[PDB]
């Protein structure tokens, strides 16, 4: 099952660097309680403007959002950015107001 992040708007303002984000995602993603897994159960790839998560295990879109938020907090982009649902499989960064 595919889950998406349309990272365009802040990626095209340089402030968002997809490569770092991908790494962060890799680090974070717990699998039955351990971060270092990400085996045959989850895959993460990236376009220039889009992050892709594909899951075989019970996985929550909420989790992705949370991760994104965490990332934002880390890189100080909290008052500028927002995670928003577009389509059911599709999350997207949007500018705060």
Partner RNA sequence: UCUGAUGGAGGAUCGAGUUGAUACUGACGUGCAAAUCGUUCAUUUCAAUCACGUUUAGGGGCGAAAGACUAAUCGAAAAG
Partner RNA sequence: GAGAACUUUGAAGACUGAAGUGGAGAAGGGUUUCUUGUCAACUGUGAUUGAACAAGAGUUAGCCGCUCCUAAGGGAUAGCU
Partner RNA sequence: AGAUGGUAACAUAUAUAUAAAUGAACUCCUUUACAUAGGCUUUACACUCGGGGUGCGUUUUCUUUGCACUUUACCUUUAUAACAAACCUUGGAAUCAAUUUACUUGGAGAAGAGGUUCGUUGAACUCAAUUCAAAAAUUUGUUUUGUAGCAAUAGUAAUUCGUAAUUAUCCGAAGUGGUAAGGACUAUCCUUGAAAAAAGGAGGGAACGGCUUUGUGCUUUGCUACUCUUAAUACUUGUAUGAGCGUACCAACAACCGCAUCAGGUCUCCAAGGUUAACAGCCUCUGGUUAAAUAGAAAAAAGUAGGUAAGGGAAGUCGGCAAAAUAGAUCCGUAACUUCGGGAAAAGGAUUGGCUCUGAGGACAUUAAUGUUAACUCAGAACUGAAACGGACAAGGGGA
Asked whether 15 and 72 are in contact (CB, 8 A), the reply is: no
What is the C-alpha to C-alpha distance for residues 79 and 38, in angstroms, rounded to an integer? 31
Q: How far is the CB of 49 from RNA (least distance, A)?
A: 18
Among positions 12, 26, 39, 70, the unique one binding RNA when judged by CB under 7 A: 70
Tell me which residues in 35-64 interact with RNA (CB under 7 A): 35, 58-63
CB neighbour list of residue 3: distance below 8 Å, 6 or more residues apart = 52, 53, 54, 55, 59, 61, 64, 89, 90, 91
Q: How far is the CB of 41 from RNA (least distance, A)?
A: 11
Q: Which of 2, 26, 56, 78 touches RNA by CB under 7 A?
A: 78
**Residues near RNA (CB under 7 A):** 30-33, 35, 58-63, 65-66, 69-70, 72-74, 78, 82-85, 88, 94
């Amino acid at each position: 099952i595919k889950y998406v992040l349309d990272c365009t708007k802040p990626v095209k303002d340089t402030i968002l660097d997809i490569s770092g984000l991908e790494q962060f995602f890799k680090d974070k993603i717990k699998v039955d309680k351990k971060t270092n897994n990400l085996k045959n159960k989850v895959v993460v790839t990236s376009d220039e403007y889009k992050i892709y998560i594909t899951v075989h295990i019970p996985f929550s879109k909420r989790y992705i959002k949370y991760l994104a938020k965490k990332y934002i907090k880390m890189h100080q982009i909290r008052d500028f950015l927002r995670v928003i649902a577009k389509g059911k499989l599709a999350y997207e960064f949007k500018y705060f107001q």
